[PDB]
Amino acid sequence: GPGMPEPAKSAPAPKKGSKKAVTKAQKKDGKKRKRSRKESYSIYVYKVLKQVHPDTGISSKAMGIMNSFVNDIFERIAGEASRLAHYNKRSTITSREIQTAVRLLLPGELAKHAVSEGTKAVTKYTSAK
């Protein structure tokens, strides 16, 4: 009856979105008309340069050398991750074996940057598109 108090209701549950139709994905493999530069270490060359030294640019030569410098240790990291997978009796490299492979090659503060703060930085890569 109307003399009784109305009980406290929860906030209304949001309506579920309709099933969006999955369209025909256009072929972006082997494309000739792109603005993306050939995917290489150049990504971070400009990023960390502008972050630390906003007043200072870089040459195409110096960029190419920094890419080579990273590749020479990246090859070793891949080799160590492969070695770890072999000792762990795996056919595949894990998302953890790569961290250890880097740590083994990078003594002292180099692992604190590349591995410890590297693992903290994963949150940025998952949150941002």
């Binding site: 369209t23 025909k24 256009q26 972006k28 792109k34 993306s36 995917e39 270490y41 990504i43 971070y44 060359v45 990023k47 960390v48 340069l49 630390v52 030294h53 007043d55 200072t56 640019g57 870089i58 040459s59 110096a62 050398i65 920094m66 410098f69 990273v70 020479d72 240790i73 990246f74 070793r76 990291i77 891949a78 991750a81 492969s82 997978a85 795996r90 056919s91 595949t92 490299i93 894990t94 998302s95 790569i98 961290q99 880097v102 090659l105 990078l106 003594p107 002292g108 503060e109 180099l110 940057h113 590349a114 591995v115 703060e117 590297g118 693992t119 930085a121 994963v122 890569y125 998952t126």
Partner: protein, 133 residues
Amino acid sequence: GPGMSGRGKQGGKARAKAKTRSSRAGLQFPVGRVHRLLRKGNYSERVGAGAPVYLAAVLEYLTAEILELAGNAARDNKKTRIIPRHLQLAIRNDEELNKLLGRVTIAQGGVLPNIQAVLLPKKTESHHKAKGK
């Protein structure tokens, strides 16, 4: 007055093009290609989805100290851009950059700045005056 009539013959029309997708075109991001670069490298049988992401974080730091010291060398030499001569200096003059580039150097047995005591060889007993006749 009256308009001109169309030809009585049928067909000969241009065929209608297929309708384009309703879904909007996304931007190209690089980490999905880094996954394929790891596969092309053939490091193992399958590449985990997190592997190129975690390696991208590693890669950023792998030249961060190179960029820092090369940019310091550029500022010191009053240059507008980093050039190969700044890398020749920065690499050779810093042992952590010698570790980042190529062959990893041994961390222990590194030279300390404070003068260490010279470890003298164990001296033999000095020849005392021999007893004469």
